[PDB]
Amino acid sequence: ENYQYDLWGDSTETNDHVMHLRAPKLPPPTNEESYNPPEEYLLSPEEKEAWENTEYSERERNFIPQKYSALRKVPGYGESIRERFERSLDLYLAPR
Amino acid sequence: NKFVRAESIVAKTLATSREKERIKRVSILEDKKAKNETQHIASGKDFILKITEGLIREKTTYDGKPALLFIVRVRGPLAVNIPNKAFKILSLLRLVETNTGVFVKLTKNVYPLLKVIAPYVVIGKPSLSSIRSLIQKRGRIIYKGENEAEPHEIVLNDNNIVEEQLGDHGIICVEDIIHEIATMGESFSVCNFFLQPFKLNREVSGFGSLNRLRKIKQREAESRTRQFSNAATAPVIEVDIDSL
Amino acid sequence: FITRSQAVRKLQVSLADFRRLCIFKGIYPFYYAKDIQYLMHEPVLAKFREHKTFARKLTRALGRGEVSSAKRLEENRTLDHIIKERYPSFPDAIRDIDDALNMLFLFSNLPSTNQVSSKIINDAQKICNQWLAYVAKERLVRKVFVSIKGVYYQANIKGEEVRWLVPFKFPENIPSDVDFRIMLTFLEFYSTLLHFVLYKLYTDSGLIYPPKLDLKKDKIISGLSSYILESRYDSPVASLFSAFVFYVSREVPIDILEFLILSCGGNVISEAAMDSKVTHQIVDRPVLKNKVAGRTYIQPQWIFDCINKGELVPANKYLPGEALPPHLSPW
Amino acid sequence: KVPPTIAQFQYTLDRNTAAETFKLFNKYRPETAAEKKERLTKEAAAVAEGSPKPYAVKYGLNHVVALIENKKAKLVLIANDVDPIELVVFLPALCKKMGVPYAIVKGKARLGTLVNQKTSAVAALTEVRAEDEAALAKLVSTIDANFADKYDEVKKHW
After folding, report:
1. Is D114 in contact with C65 (Cβ distance < 8 A)?
2. By CB distance 3.0 to 4.6 Å, which of A38, C120, C302, D140 could disulfide with C318?
3. Chain D partners within 8 Å of C75 (Cβ)
4. Contact residues on chain C for D35, CB-CB shorter than 8 A
5. Residue C213's Cα: distance from chain center in Å?
6. Residue A81 lies in a domain
7. Residue A13 counted as domain residue
8. Among B112, B93, B102, which Cα is nearest to B35's?
């Protein structure tokens, strides 16, 4: 019988007493990186080659937009773990 | 490299001789049963034993109905060199790899073959949810890579791959394979070959400080759950294979 | 100003334990000298050193050849009070729960491996199922976004607008570059925080906690729909598809579609569930061989567009095999 | 050089024979404090609500010495690294005079591991079950040829 207690209870105050609580900097909303984005953002072969040429840490646009009219046609994503691990590292491994 | 001790080789020889003696009797009994030599045998029919959780056993007569089954390697007997008679069967079924699994369809002829190699592996009927989870979270698929070589058995990365490989029997997504495995579909054999191994995660995988105690506990619990009956008439032992 | 080396020397703590303490205290880097002095008093460090000593004791017991002693030492052995100070109020915890939810969702799909205990994966899956059940019961979801890396789900818990990513149900790759040790330490705290928040919400306004899985249904339809719980309109997402049975073909995953329809208030049945008022069906195959008029065949995109809009748009640009309209970001 | 009585050590049970002796001894581990406590608590609980002698190895130096000279002990183990060597100089000769077989094993620490104690410097067994009596007799017979016949000239090597 654990966790059966109000951890926070009545509380309406923030950490403003000490302003060292830096904002978590949560990721912003998406930027049309959908499986069915506008046809204008359909990466061309030249654009795809240019994106592939760039290496890690210089890929601000870290997604290859493409159109998939069928859900089954969506390819598997294996880079999700690496990207979120990098986010976790950057959460607290950067000077502030 | 390592020197071979006399005791180890002697133990291996004794265990191999015992297993060969058991296997010869099992094969003779199975051949006689196939010939309908019911004149003098220990048991006319056969049974399948089930162990469930405190721990109690269940026994039921074998029923002539096909059913989906999953088999995993148990890594033993500890000191028995697999005889060619069973080695060929294991190699054909590609379960020789430790901790590897594969789905098979129960049949009247398959059951006697399983009886011979029953101690070497663990068998049972997985649940639909467990089958779906395993298929969607594991399973190797051999294909020709990009153009040249075919070492990429990693995972079913894209559904379009399944359409390309076969294209004909309507197998366009992983759910089609799941349905064909759960149901007694014709494509069960086709997709079964497509996914030859099922490399399930192994045990603690190490010794450590506490990991050594965990391994010892697992080993001692195996003896209290699994047992090498060695009886030529030993009923097949079913367990909750989904517990993983 | 002191540095990581000075902090480690003063605290007399291992690098992994130092990182764990920094994460549990959010001591962002040089390091904050004024905060390390406060960190000098930490029961978590005492527990860590006690566990380290117990490890040596267990190794000694194993070496001496005494299983009973080892069992006694192992049996005879938290972040609850840590959360008290790093989350001053519930709104802050709700705001910061985005990373915790994302980590739990990512780990729930990770296959069991030697580098990650299967118990951790099971706990993450249970937490994700509990969160999905809570969201469906409260219908607080407002927008759905599909991406190549998953579906960018979001919730409006107390107006937070948190955005939690749901990874696609597929075998997850396991690159050796990622250090699971740090990920495991993060996941432990995130799971504890999620458990606390879920219990608090369930007791204050939700349902019984912890919910129990539907054993009978868990054998066949394990997932969000396999949960049973009981207690003791603000947006179209909570009113759409009222009493509408949205059938789903074998191609699409029921787990994803069923969540949305159940949150709205409808029902979903899949052809593979068996392995009726069927007003609608979702089909993604190139050819609709079934060709039935009773079940309204519509591409699944319309559900997302209707959820993001709420007008129940017809299937005009949603015919099976027809190119779907661009999924513009609602933000 | 050392006197003839010294250097009688350094000739000890071999790895195979020592391993066999430890395996046989490992089957008679005396009940530890925790095991005895839990057993007694269970017995008391059963009594409140409403077996022969426990065979175990003898390791106490005083107890072992008392067992010797009475022919009760069937086998004796001697630690070679005993810091007060005077405590162990007379044990081999005394056992030989009494005709009790013994085998020297390297390491007091290793010897103590079989009795859940840091060091005991001695170990012996008197009672043995039927399943292990034959094994104990065979080990005793083997130890004779292994040690006594291989070092009949131990008096040399000053």
Report:
1. yes
2. C302
3. none
4. 68
5. 16
6. yes
7. no
8. B112
B175 to C250: CB separation less than 8 angstroms, yes or no: yes
Contact state of C175 with A24 under an 8 Å Cβ cutoff = no
Distance CA B197, CA B153 (A): 10
Structure tokens at B169: 């029997």
Smallest Cβ–Cβ distance between A73 and the set B156, B157, B160 belongs to B160
Helix (H) or strand (E) holding C180: helix C180-204
Question: Which one-letter amino acid corresponds to residue D128?
Answer: V
> Using the beta-carbon criterion (under 8 Å), do C220 and B127 form an inter-chain contact?
yes
Q: Quick one: which of A75, A96, A56, A89 has its CA closest to C103?
A: A89
- Answer yes or no: are the C-beta atoms of C276 and C270 closer than 8 Å: no
The DSSP secondary structure of A33-93, one letter per residue, reads: -BSS--GGG---HHHHHHHHHS-TTS-SS-------SSGGGPPP--SHHHHHHHHHHHHHS
Helix (H, G, I), strand (E, B) or coil at C46: helix
Residues 6+ apart with CB under 8 A from B97: B73, B197, B199
Domain count, chain A: 1
Given a contact cutoff of 8 angstroms between Cβ atoms, the answer to whether B187 and B180 are in contact is: yes
Tell me which method was used to determine the 3D structure.
cryo-EM
- Of 3.40.50.300, 3.40.50.10380, 3.30.1330.30, 3.20.20.70, which CATH number belongs to D1-158? 3.30.1330.30
With an 8 Å Cβ cutoff, is C89 touching chain A?
yes
Documented resolution in Å:
4.4
- Nearest Cα neighbor of B211 from B203, B220, B202, B221 is B203
Tell which residue, C194, C259, C188, C191, has the closest CA to residue C221. Answer: C259
Distance from CA of B182 to the nearest CA of C (A): 7
List Cβ neighbours of C86 (8 Å cut-off, separation of 6 or more). Answer: C24, C25, C26
Is there a domain that residue A8 lies in? Answer: no
Give the structural domain span for A53.
21-94
How far apart CA D100 and CA D78 sit, in angstroms, is 13
Query: What is the distance between the alpha carbons of residues D30 and C199, in angstroms, rounded to a whole number?
Result: 49
Q: Which of B176, B177, B213, B209 is nearest to B194 (CA)?
A: B177
Listing DSSP states for B222-239 in one string gives HHHH------TTPPEEE-
Say whether D116 and C69 touch across the interface (CB within 8 A): yes
Rg over CA atoms, chain B: 20
Number of residues that this document lists for chain B = 244
